Amino acid sequence: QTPDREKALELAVAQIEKSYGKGSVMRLGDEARQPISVIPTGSIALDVALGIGGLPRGRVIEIYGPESSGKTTVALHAVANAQAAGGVAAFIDAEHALDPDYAKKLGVDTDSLLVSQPDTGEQALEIADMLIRSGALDIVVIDSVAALVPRAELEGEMGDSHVGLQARLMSQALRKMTGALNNSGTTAIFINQLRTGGKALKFYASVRMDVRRVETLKDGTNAVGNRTRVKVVKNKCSPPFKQAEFDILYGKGISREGSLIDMGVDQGLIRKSGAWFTYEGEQLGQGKENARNFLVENADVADEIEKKIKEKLGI
Ligand code: NA
Numbered sequence: 001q002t003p004d005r006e007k008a009l010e011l012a013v014a015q016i017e018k019s020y021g022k023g024s025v026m027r028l029g030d031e032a033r034q035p036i037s038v039i040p041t042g043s044i045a046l047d048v049a050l051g052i053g054g055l056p057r058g059r060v061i062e063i064y065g066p067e068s069s070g071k072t073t074v075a076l077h078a079v080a081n082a083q084a085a086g087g088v089a090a091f092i093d094a095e096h097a098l099d100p101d102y103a104k105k106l107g108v109d110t111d112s113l114l115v116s117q118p119d120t121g122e123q124a125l126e127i128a129d130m131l132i133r134s135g136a137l138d139i140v141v142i143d144s145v146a147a148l149v150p151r152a153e154l155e156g157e158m159g160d161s162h163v164g165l166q167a168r169l170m171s172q173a174l175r176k177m178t179g180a181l182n183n184s185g186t187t188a189i190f191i192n193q194l195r196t197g198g199k200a201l202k203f204y205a206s207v208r209m210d211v212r213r214v215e216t217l218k219d220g221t222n223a224v225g226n227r228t229r230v231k232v233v234k235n236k237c238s239p240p241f242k243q244a245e246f247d248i249l250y251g252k253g254i255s256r257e258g259s260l261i262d263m264g265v266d267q268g269l270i271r272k273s274g275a276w277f278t279y280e281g282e283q284l285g286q287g288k289e290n291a292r293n294f295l296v297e298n299a300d301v302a303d304e305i306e307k308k309i310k311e312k313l314g315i
Pocket residue numbers: 072097098099102
């Protein structure tokens with residue numbers, strides 16, 4: 001472009017940035033502006049796709065997809081890591097599907113996990129709000145949006161008529177919740193299905209993640225887990241529309257080790273030979289699984305690889 005023109009564009013981008021907050025406009029090629037702390041997701045691939053190395057703090061987040069997609073598994077990792085860094089976590093549950101043992105195996109401090117099973121939608125969000133305004137929570141997860149049924153509808157239509165009262169109930173709540181989240185620095189993840197009040201969440205959220213099962217991972221001829229794909233369809237902290245893939249193993253969750261290998265070869269830090277993954281002259285293993293297993297059994301070298309990937313990308 002011309003220099004006389006670039007002055008006015010930078011002026012305009014700045015006015016947008018100042019008038020409506022940072023992230024209001026971005027070139028898709030732009031670098032991510034790194035926050036102090038974030039909540040990692042369990043996949044380095046996703047952390048990278050998110051730009052800022054994980055989920056932002058003090059913001060609303062939506063993770064969505066069909067049933068048995070992996071959306072909750074991603075949400076639970078966010079919880080696990082938030083706790084691992086000394087944070088308190090809450091789980092606002094209107095579905096009653098949570099598996100604590102799976103959550104444990106994946107990394108959650110279940111004993112410490114605050115859990116609430118509310119009577120109504122407004123109660124769910126009212127409780128979340130009170131839990132947030134304490135300033136003691138790092139992460140709160142709402143499972144799920146579709147289950148936030150209004151009092152009136154639960155009481156036999158006694159008190160309302162509008163079929164879209166639930167959407168109105170989300171809208172009101174999110175307006176008040178938004179201020180509480182930024183002040184507190186608390187992350188709120190709303191889990192949502194594809195198949196009630198997701199229209200407001202779509203605009204209030206700073207990150208929206210589209211989660212999908214892509215392919216089954218087999219052991220000879222038996223189902224071990226699923227190849228998962230996530231597109232960041234909305235991102236107010238870094239350029240949107242990035243996507244990542246990673247493995248969710250039944251009983252164990254997102255393989256951090258698999259995602260390190262994938263991004264290892266993606267960045268040329270891990271080389272091939274003949275189905276042989278190698279690192280810094282040493283060999284990790286023959287085939288994808290042996291390398292994965294090697295990194296599990298050698299956590300020190302897995303961290304070397306994690307460190308070596310972040311530094312190369314800022315993250
Ligand atoms: Na679960």
